[PDB]
Write a protein that binds this ligand. Sequence first.
Ligand code: ATP
Ligand code: ADP
Ligand code: MG
Lengths: 152, 96, 360, 48, 193
Amino acid sequence: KEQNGDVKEAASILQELQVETYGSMEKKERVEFILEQMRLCLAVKDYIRTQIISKKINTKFFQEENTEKLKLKYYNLMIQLDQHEGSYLSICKHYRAIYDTPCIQAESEKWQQALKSVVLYVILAPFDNEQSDLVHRISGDKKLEEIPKYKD
Amino acid sequence: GSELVQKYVGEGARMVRELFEMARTKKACLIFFDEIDAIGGARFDDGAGGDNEVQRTMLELINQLDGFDPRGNIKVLMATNRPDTLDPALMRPGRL
Amino acid sequence: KLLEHKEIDGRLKELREQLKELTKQYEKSENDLKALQSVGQIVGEVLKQLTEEKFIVKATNGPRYVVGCRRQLDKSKLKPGTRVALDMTTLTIMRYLPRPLVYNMSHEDPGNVSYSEIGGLSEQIRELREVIELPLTNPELFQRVGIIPPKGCLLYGPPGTGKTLLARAVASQLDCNFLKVVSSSIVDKYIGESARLIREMFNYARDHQPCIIFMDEIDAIGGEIQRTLMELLNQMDGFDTLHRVKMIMATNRPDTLDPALLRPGRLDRKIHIDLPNEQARLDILKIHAGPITKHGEIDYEAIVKLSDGFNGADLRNVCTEAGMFAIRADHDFVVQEDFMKAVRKVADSKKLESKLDYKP
Amino acid sequence: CTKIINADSEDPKYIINVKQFAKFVVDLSDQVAPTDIEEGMRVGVDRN
Amino acid sequence: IKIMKSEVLRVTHELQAMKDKIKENSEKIKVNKTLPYLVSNVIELLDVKCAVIKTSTRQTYFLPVIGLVDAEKLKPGDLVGVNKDSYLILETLPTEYDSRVKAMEVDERPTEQYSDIGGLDKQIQELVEAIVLPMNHKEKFENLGIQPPKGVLMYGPPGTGKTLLARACAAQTKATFLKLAGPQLVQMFIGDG
Ligand SMILES: Nc1ncnc2c1ncn2[C@@H]1O[C@H](COP(=O)(O)OP(=O)(O)OP(=O)(O)O)[C@@H](O)[C@H]1O
Ligand SMILES: Nc1ncnc2c1ncn2[C@@H]1O[C@H](COP(=O)(O)OP(=O)(O)O)[C@@H](O)[C@H]1O
Ligand SMILES: [Mg+2]
């Protein structure tokens, strides 16, 4: 139904599906379904439901073996959600989590883009103790030399 | 019956132990528990504590009368003009 | 002459190593000499903080003194209820210390009971999840809708069917410390003491131990008796949701209930567990006979045929007595061919049970 | 005398129980003989 | 010849002087020991190498240093003789049993066969299979993968024969039977029971 342009109908159809109920369902499959629900809700811009689904998914799965793609997609969707919301500090934290992934770390352009986003969003964040802490942490990074303008 | 009932916890039981030991030291001693209703009541717990200490002394007397560690040649005399209040364990025909 | 010099050098090396061992011994001896000059310190409890430099401390088995802190100590660490080490002469608080009792029967930790051990409670397990996982996993959804979390969830049903097993399973699923109530340090309604028992109920759980509670005498309080019920209602009525005293009760019978508890917040959920299903009993046999060394083919449906009106604990001692008669007849194995006769003899007045006997 | 420690049968040591006061590890005075002080019996101890 | 005489005299002098230091320190330790030792139970050992001591005088003290014994060779509940004044652990003590506890052991080994019990064969069989089978068979339980019960409760009206079956089990076993009673585990002195 999404491929036919019925994004709202597809999101509504996928929303009623409660992944947590199906215990026998594989954890990676469950998280993939959760991320699909996230994507559909963001496509239909139901940000409250997206936040609820974000509360549904746990943050300890992304530190596993083959969860790199799931981690990247989930953090991209969370970045989109907080981009609509405007919480720049949460966006910076999500981008930092993206940058710490080994897959992005390996590829040059991907980690460079992740660091660019991290520094730009920590710049966008309002001044506070946590923002200053994050600025100190990000500034004390050696890879910033690969992005001279961003380091300056 | 006023000395098996002591102020401190477990002193009546020790009193019974030492009494039975002294009886065993003598050859074929006789013991007469006059007015056994005093320390021969019925065990209970619905009273939220009850006597406990008196019940413990009675239980130790029960143990000395019959059970492990055979009592020996100690014939026991017990008298009471109200026997229906005695513990069935004490009234059991292995002790009396 | 090189070999003789090497031999004397080796003996010299041995003697030097012996001297190093003597060095270690002498340093230990000097250390114990230094330890001798030390003097023990009384252990005390800080009842109250008087001023920035005055404390009231009672010895463990002695009187209470007004004393002062030594100097280089954190007065924040010295709170009413902390164990400290008074100097034995000046009584000054030299240092603080980390802290049987009635709580010796309070804990009843869940253990490592998981979902796999419990068999044939799929709908019941889903009910427990839908009732409890939201207060644990997502307490914020209640704020989103704007309602106090549900506290009283009654998993009423026959005892020995796995109520606490279900609770331990979900607890291990969330790895939350399941503090099942063993009365002591948690008795509240018990009319012997009024408010000290309330204090123990509250402080021992929730505050010290995070959450996840239960209760013993599963059908006692669910069913002076009127005043006992009013005091129970006062104990359970409604408490702060910051601290969890979730009363997951599992009373054994339905008639042991009164309308005074049916109000939500008091007892909202009514999770019902019935007599175990034949397939559910089958799964319980499977999991419980897992551990027993069962060589050969086991046709558990035959033993299911005569397992009607049982509970989980019945099935557990079925497996235990399978092992028992395997010992009695010297069989490392246990087959269904005698499972049949055992289930033939596990139903009488006291459910027969142990008389099932023949089972390997 | 609660127990005979008997470290080497030359410095034997003796664990005694002073009714309710305490329990102690003491040695006999030279007046009495070790064979005369058996385990479990009651004895008089100096106060110092 | 240089190495042999030089280093021989060197290590000999160092060893002799250091052994003299050993002897003097040890002699001072023993003269510090003296008597008596106030016996105490180590409630726990904390790091900071330090121990909490419960003396037989029903007094709990703290010890920043544990004294002349080894912390590794110590555990909660240990019996240690400490100084009466400084309350410092002077010696470790072997486990000690009270005189009543020592007399609690069955040595007469009464003579009551299982045949003396009448009308109780189910109960006798259960007690044998739950108290004697786990005793003299052991590994057979492990091979089958079941756990024998730890304890047995025998309850009933007086005169049914509970104490008789206990005496028969003591008679018909080679185990170390330890008779006792509920009342005797009650003492006025706190903590004695
Ligand atoms: N079933 C029995 N068969 C044979 N003798 C029995 C039986 N029951 C009791 N007796 C006899 O009863 C006498 C005393 O009973 P015993 O104290 O041994 O039993 P009990 O039930 O343990 O008693 P209590 O509950 O009073 O401690 C003994 O001499 C014993 O031989
Ligand atoms: N679904 C099940 N799977 C395996 N064993 C079970 C199951 N249900 C019950 N049992 C067994 O039965 C007993 C259940 O006792 P339980 O219901 O916890 O009693 P209570 O709830 O009164 O404490 C346990 O010993 C357990 O081994
Ligand atoms: Mg008896």
